Every structure is written in C-alpha cells, then in structure tokens.
Amino acid sequence: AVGKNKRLSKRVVDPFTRKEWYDIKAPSTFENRNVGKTLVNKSVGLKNASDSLKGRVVEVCLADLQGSEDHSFRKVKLRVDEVQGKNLLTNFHGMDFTTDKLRSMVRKWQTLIEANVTVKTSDDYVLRIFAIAFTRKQANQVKRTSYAQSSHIRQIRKVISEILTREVQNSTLAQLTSKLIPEVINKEIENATKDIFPLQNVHIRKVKLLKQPKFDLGSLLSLHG
C-alpha cells in the first residue's frame, strides 16, 4: 500500500468526465423492455463508440425481464448489435441457469439425465441446448432411492434429443424464446417421457448460440419497436 520494486520494463485524467451513458432495450418478446444502462468512453471519431459497443453482452436475470419471481433461477445473455443513440438495441445471445438452482436440484439418491443437442433453428441460427432431468420418487415409495436403468436413460435421452430437434428446427429464435419464457417445452418433455419413469423437474439448460447468418437488419428492426 506504499511502493514496490517498480521494474519498468503524473499525467492523470478523470475517468468519468470523458465517459457517457447508454440505455439498453430488450427484444419485444421480453416483458420489461427497459434493461439498464452501460458506461462508454465519450464519442470520438476514428474509433467511434459504435465500434466498441456492437458485440458487448449484457447479463440479466429472467425474473428482471419478466417481473415475477418464478423466473429467478434463469439468466439470459443479450448481445449488443445496433446503436440508436442514448439507447442501444440488443438481439438475443444466450440463456442459462443460475448455478444455485442447478446445484440445488442435483441431490443424492436420484441420478441425473443430461441431454445435449446441436441443432440449426428455423432460420439460420446454429444453437446448442442442454436438458437436465432428475429421477422422482413416486408418492408411494418405501425404497429410499430412485435410480434409473441405463436403458431408461438411453430412451429418455434420445426422446429429449428429438424433442429439442423439432422444437428448434421448426420455429425461429424469437418463437423459440416465446416457448422458453413459459417453459412449455419442459412440461412437454415431462409428458412425453412420463411412460418411462417419473423424471422430476426437467429443465432446459444453457441455451447456447453457435452461429448467426449475416446481420438481418430487418430482423432487428422488427424485434425492437
């Protein structure tokens, strides 16, 4: 907290005076469209602020973007693409679980089932989807455990693979997020796999973007308004 070797192998300026604030607007599918503000250096040509902004990522809880608390454990990543001025427009980037819920529902005496899939969406987006499921005690258990046989994991895992394949390849990322908000796909998986084993608390994990077509300016303009 004093001095050090200083192996160099005043002229100070204020950090904030040359800095400026920008607003973030969410895709119209999300409920609370206003997200927040981000700090930028002041706009100077030859490295305008626009070049620095486009490409940034904003990391926001889904409960924030909907308002209710039932979406606390989810957490969406948004990608900065278009700069409007004092307000920037962001396209969907990814969506994830908070580590706490994931670590909470991975308990003992119930093996998990993971289902990874890499799928092109309707339009051009190459995406990766994870699915996490946990075995459920039927409400008559006297055996203290609910292990599943590897045949059952094989069946459930495959079924989830085609379920995600259909639900992604059919509809675009906007419609995908529309299914993602009220987690209809989760209950769909639970119903489609109900005949194999109870399978408590299925969920969609780490909706991960892989590839995007060019820019599709019109898509962004339709997204925000």
Binding site: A1, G36, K37, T38, L39, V40, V58, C61
Partner: protein, 129 residues
C-alpha cells in the same frame, strides 16, 4: 425500474487478498478496482475482513460519486483447481457494501468449477506443511 443505476460488485474472495472490483452491466467498463490489500499495511491481513470492509467502503464512495446505487453482486472464490471454497474477506466486503447506502439485487455465486480438468498442484502425498 425506479430510475436506478445498476452495477455488479462481483467480489473475488480468495484465501488471501480479497478482491472488490465493480463494473457495469456489460462487465467491461471497470469502476473502483480498489482491493483489500489497498487498505491494509501488513500485506498478510489482506484476507482479513478489515481489508475487505475498507475496500468496500471506498468502492461505495466511488460508486456514489459516479452514480451507481444498486448493485448485482457476483461472489467468486478462486475455485477451479484451488479448493472451490469462498474466502473470508469477500463476505465482509459484501456486508460493508450493503451497509453504506447502496442497494443490492441478484447476488450470484460465480465460482469457476471444473469437470475434472487440470491434473493440479501438490503431488501424490500433497501438501506436507
């Protein structure tokens, strides 16, 4: 929103020299990098709660100067290969941030955890202190 200026505290709490390093929502633009060792003289009580508390208070003063009022804390440990365990200072830093006017929201555990990577340091019999 109530016209709030959100931020992220994202405390990094090792077993030595607790870190407090606030940045914007984008995570790129840093504010108040002041750490625990900044505010203690021994260079060895850096992990002690006092260092983290003074660092957090100075961060809070800087945030009030720059307008950031409510925060989104991301508690982190060294994790990965090293012990997966939160340090003692970071929690005190979080509490000190809580006291000094600022508001909180969505505190997160962002501990980096491996899926058995990195044949790691120590040797067979490990530490022999």
């Amino acid at each position: 929103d109530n016209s709030q200026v959100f931020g992220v505290a994202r405390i990094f709490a090792s077993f030595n020299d607790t870190f407090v390093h606030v940045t914007d929502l984008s995570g790129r633009e840093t504010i108040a990098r002041v750490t625990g060792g900044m505010k203690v003289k021994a260079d060895r009580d850096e992990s002690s709660p006092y260092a983290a508390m003074l660092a957090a208070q100075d961060v809070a003063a800087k945030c009030k100067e720059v307008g950031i009022t409510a925060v989104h804390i991301k508690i982190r440990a060294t994790g990965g290969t090293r012990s997966k365990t939160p340090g003692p200072g970071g929690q005190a830093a979080l509490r000190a941030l809580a006291r000094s006017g600022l508001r909180i929201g969505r505190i997160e555990d962002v501990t980096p955890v491996p899926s058995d990577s990195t044949r790691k340091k120590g040797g067979r019999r490990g530490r022999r202190l």
